[PDB]
Design a protein around this ligand. Structure first.
Ligand SMILES: NC(=O)c1ccc[n+]([C@@H]2O[C@H](COP(=O)([O-])OP(=O)(O)OC[C@H]3O[C@@H](n4cnc5c(N)ncnc54)[C@H](O)[C@@H]3O)[C@@H](O)[C@H]2O)c1
Ligand SMILES: NC(=O)c1ccc[n+]([C@@H]2O[C@H](COP(=O)([O-])OP(=O)(O)OC[C@H]3O[C@@H](n4cnc5c(N)ncnc54)[C@H](O)[C@@H]3O)[C@@H](O)[C@H]2O)c1
Ligand SMILES: NC(=O)c1ccc[n+]([C@@H]2O[C@H](COP(=O)([O-])OP(=O)(O)OC[C@H]3O[C@@H](n4cnc5c(N)ncnc54)[C@H](O)[C@@H]3O)[C@@H](O)[C@H]2O)c1
Ligand SMILES: NC(=O)c1ccc[n+]([C@@H]2O[C@H](COP(=O)([O-])OP(=O)(O)OC[C@H]3O[C@@H](n4cnc5c(N)ncnc54)[C@H](O)[C@@H]3O)[C@@H](O)[C@H]2O)c1
Ligand SMILES: [Cl-]
Ligand SMILES: [Cl-]
Ligand SMILES: [Cl-]
Ligand SMILES: [Cl-]
Lengths: 333, 334, 338, 334
């Protein structure tokens, strides 16, 4: 089975390898590109503030990591076209740096000798997969594909089930979400976004997201029907997405919950809970999204009805399990 | 006409009531406090505040009093309000902040013990419930026990009133992303019967019920039964935000919504406006009960259908207290 | 052939420590069986707290409940709700050893109520005055079959004692002072407000560095008699959920180098399931879930020397919740077999 | 005297330098700022502060300036100090707050770029290093590049000075339990070659090195080489504490230590005293470089051996900044 390279050995990139080893994937990770020394990547891989000690041995040499006894070449090329993917035969690149989020930009990996790129972020108008929502749209001719955001992977399965069961006419979402590396530790410049410049562990911070606006790449029938944003708050990982919808039918809360429960049955990407969990309970989830029946709310006056549905997601590990499900299929094609 | 206040419950709100009266140089004087602890400990907590920093006035204590800015305040430790000797120092209006007398029936005890009026710092069932600069005109001279609802009501009501007056609210649901409070838990452990309240508040996003929207009708009677909502409690110490998703009575643009809110906030001591990219710590110490944030307005339109999201910040401690004090100063003149 | 050791346990106080006691006993597949729990709350709430843990994540076994029990990994555990230990009906399911985790019975006088209630022995998860007090793999050889009520001291004691023991054995400790930079606990406050008579305990624990008294150093003589009255110290409670670190500054009986100290400490951690060693640049979250009572950190060793005066700073990490619990369980397993 | 200042690095320290200068109505004139960003973003950050709240003065900007309390401040964006055009507005003293010029050879660049003096907001090697009200009398009219050491030095030095003057410090070791800073990481990820600095600062106790004790001899020459120490960085946003364990030259009691420190803080604008049970958030906004805490003094004695533990609080941002400004004011006049 296919050989993989990881560009960007960050929060997502390191967890990609963790999850591939955890599921004993036949994918062989043969090369990693980042901006730093093997010694430092080894330290970051062995010790994780969110998920604890790495479950396999980690060592490094001057130019590689040794993970569970197996060598992974380490490169440090800030420009992707300079990465020597052919040296170890990396055919599929998991693109996790944040800096190649377009077909034009990730073309650099194919120029550098790879066959396919899976981008761990929204990447404009390209094929965009939420596993177990629209992964059947992948085919053998795709070369550059996106798995959208963590938030998309949370929102899409819930929106899909509601639309399939009842029709979504229009809706808006807010995700209350763990802070990430795009934000700031102390108040200081963070590119052009003013709110991103503010101390992330000390604030509720409004944040734009494209999860709702671009949902049509994943669920074409919902194109233009959703908007949304984020409130970034001081938890280290673990997030929750609220969606307020007008549906195509009057419903009860039990009816909505029953429809979602059916959508999560035999569904390794989309979980269900009716337990009164909190964000730390989603840390380490193996789902991309967990619908929370306890938070469903129907507000009605006359023939006007608003439906609020809520799903949790581990924006790090849970999303990564979706990235890996997509990678395994992308690599078989 | 009334000028002497007693505080029952010298907690987060109780202590800030005193701070704010002194800050605005009120003619109302706090003459007595009832709590569950010693003056030494109340002095410590009044002097040193994790959220608002050092108390701006001198504080000392004796065995049975606090001395604040050179003025003596009697301190009692009566667990049952009927036993508080309000008459000794002449406390006329009781600011009821314990959480344990949130009904006209329960707070009657303060009148039984010799006070003239009670202002409850929380929802208290179906009594007159005031958001200052929304419905404080409903107060008259015959009222003896009233509520100022919750911090969340004081955040939701001014925004909902402005939208309803301008456009009509047909139906809506709110979510407040809110600072954790003392009803929650420091470590995972029992907290009465409330499962989510049992979880470590500074390490979790925790869904939480609120009556702010369900009981809005007490403040805006035309919206009775038209709103629902809840909270997501998160790890900030104070400073919160309320999102409201509404179906309005006409099609609107974001600019139209924001300009209506700007007009409702103009020369409005209770209801502020920002179009700056603020975050929750910027609201700490706010002197408003609510601050509408025009940067977060969102209109989602599909044909005849339309969802309007409006967002307002609130300092659930100090900002709310400024509203409690506005209501108190008026309540005391009627 | 083999006469059965005591095997049935009751837990008083199904709190942070009590719930982890059960987790660790199942983890190590102990032959001890928790047959009963006493707390102040319903089975429903205990089952919710056992299943969902903010510090260690989902419980690794099934959890259900009835009106009067928990069902854990298919096994029934009776649940009682007696706030006075003397009233707990320990004899109904035959609880022999009580793991006393409420914080309300920290003396022999108080904890003997469990014996009146039908138990045979009590192990207290906290300092409990001058009773027999065990840090496993430091002084557990002082336990014998006539010990009926025993203490495992505090988390901080189980961190401090193995480091002090190694230093004292190797070099002599003449005098020393400890500061533990420690995760906040349930004795503190979520928001500023009264917390008994302790002023600092009244302040918001997740928003402050908070000085805090501890007896780990002052009572060390119960565990290392030669250091009785030679140590003092305190804690700085800080905003992490679990995971702590203890610094000891000592005058030793000999001049030393940092490498000599680190080597002595490494030797003391060898073949020692209670006491670990690291020379990696770890931080507190790396100790969460530790199976040691204490992990010596060679990277933080510091020798300050002016002439014949010398100060030695030695530092050990500890998971004040799970790491401490592993020590409590090691002591319980031995206690049951004496 | 010189009156015109430039700030290099408009960060946490750089912005608070400006805030404090205005707070104390200094006659110093900040005429220029160099950073890496646009006036728009610098204006936003000056106006809204997560640790100290809203800026007390008006703030606007243009494409190349800030307008603060009505006064124009030029904004440059030169990443190499030698290219900063300090002569355009005649900046004479540079307050060097980037962390990238912490040596005489590095900060020489500001002088080549037209400035007359540099005050570095950090340790900067073997140069004149001032803790105000410990050794500011060593500042000399010919000095042109000076350091104010670290926040931790400004905490440790006044305590060590008082102990050494009264009793003699023979040897000692320090641990500061300290708020996290921008040298650390928000999420786990590379942070130069510094492994512990690479770990999520608001979720960890993180040991780290500090020169505060090792270099104390620059400030208190008799203690050169007599102190060592380090830091534990923990999740509070600002507000820190320093513990010192010492062998003294004299047998002492706690009261004796505390009284000696009390006397050293009397009439001392840089060095405060408390015997209240304060916690870190109570030091936020302090106007001292250091506040000695008598409640934490500990004497451990066995026979003729004695260890003395003394503890001082410090606001590593604003408190240190008040010391930087004191030094700057004196520096400007020499
Ligand atoms: N919650 C999350 O963190 C999350 C969830 C879903 C998707 N994503 C997306 O995944 C991607 C990475 O997110 P992350 O949290 O892992 O960020 P991160 O900052 O933790 O990791 C980025 C890694 O890429 C390295 N890097 C940066 N530029 C590079 C370059 N030119 N070449 C090679 N390496 C480079 C960095 O050293 C770092 O190690 C982003 O696109 C992000 O939007 C993040
Ligand atoms: N914290 C907020 O953000 C907020 C906002 C709006 C309204 N409120 C409401 O104000 C009231 C107080 O809230 P808080 O955050 O200050 O809680 P708190 O726990 O900080 O204060 C409660 C105080 O009352 C004392 N107390 C409890 N029972 C008492 C009794 N029988 N007699 C005398 N004293 C007693 C307690 O010792 C404590 O000092 C509550 O009803 C709350 O719902 C809180
Ligand atoms: N948390 C730590 O880091 C730590 C470490 C070592 C030792 N300890 C000690 O372990 C003991 C428990 O600590 P914890 O952190 O689990 O406290 P906790 O507050 O989390 O648990 C106490 C439990 O006991 C229950 N309880 C209280 N009184 C009771 C009573 N009279 N009868 C029955 N149940 C009662 C409570 O409902 C709660 O569930 C304490 O003595 C503590 O000093 C704590
Ligand atoms: N934060 C504290 O507690 C504290 C206390 C005492 C001393 N210090 C020291 O003060 C200095 C700054 O500390 P800080 O906390 O403000 O750091 P910071 O990261 O908050 O601010 C540094 C500023 O310098 C800018 N900058 C970086 N490189 C630059 C360059 N080449 N040219 C122009 N601008 C540049 C950055 O954009 C930023 O605005 C450091 O030397 C630090 O050691 C910090
Ligand atoms: Cl949108
Ligand atoms: Cl509701
Ligand atoms: Cl002690
Ligand atoms: Cl040193």
């Amino acid at each position: 089975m296919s050989k993989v390279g990881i560009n960007g050995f960050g929060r997502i990139g390191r967890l990609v390898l963790r999850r591939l080893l955890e599921v004993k994937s036949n994918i062989d990770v043969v090369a990693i590109n980042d901006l730093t020394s093997p010694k430092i990547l080894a330290y970051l891989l062995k010790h994780d503030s969110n998920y604890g000690p790495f479950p396999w041995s980690v060592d490094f040499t001057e130019d590689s990591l040794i993970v569970d006894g197996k060598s992974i070449a380490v490169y440090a090329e800030k420009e992707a076209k300079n990465i020597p993917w052919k040296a170890k035969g990396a055919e599929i690149i998991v693109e996790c740096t944040g800096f190649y989020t377009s077909a034009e930009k990730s073309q650099a990996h194919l120029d550098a000798g790879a066959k396919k790129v899976l981008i761990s972020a929204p990447a404009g108008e390209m094929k965009t997969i939420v596993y177990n929502v629209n992964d059947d749209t992948l085919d053998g001719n795709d070369t550059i594909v996106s798995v959208a955001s963590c938030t998309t992977n949370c929102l899409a399965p819930m929106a899909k089930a509601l639309h399939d069961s009842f029709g979504i006419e229009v809706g808006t979402m807010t995700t209350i979400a763990a802070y990430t590396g795009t934000q700031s530790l102390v108040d200081g410049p963070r590119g052009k976004d003013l709110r991103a410049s503010r101390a992330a562990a000390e604030n509720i911070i409004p944040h734009t997201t494209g999860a709702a606006k671009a949902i049509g790449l994943v669920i074409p029938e919902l194109s233009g029907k959703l908007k949304g944003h984020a409130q970034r708050v001081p938890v280290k990982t673990g997030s929750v997405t609220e969606l307020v919808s007008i549906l195509g039918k009057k419903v009860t809360a039990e009816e909505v919950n029953n429809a979602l429960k059916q959508a999560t049955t035999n569904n390794e990407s989309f979980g269900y809970t009716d337990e009164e969990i909190v964000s730390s309970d989603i840390i380490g989830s193996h789902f991309g999204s967990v619908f929370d029946a306890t938070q469903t709310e129907i507000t009605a006056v006359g023939d006007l009805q608003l439906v609020k549905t809520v799903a949790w997601y581990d924006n790090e590990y849970g999303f990564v399990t979706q990235l890996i499900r997509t990678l395994e299929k992308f690599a078989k094609l």
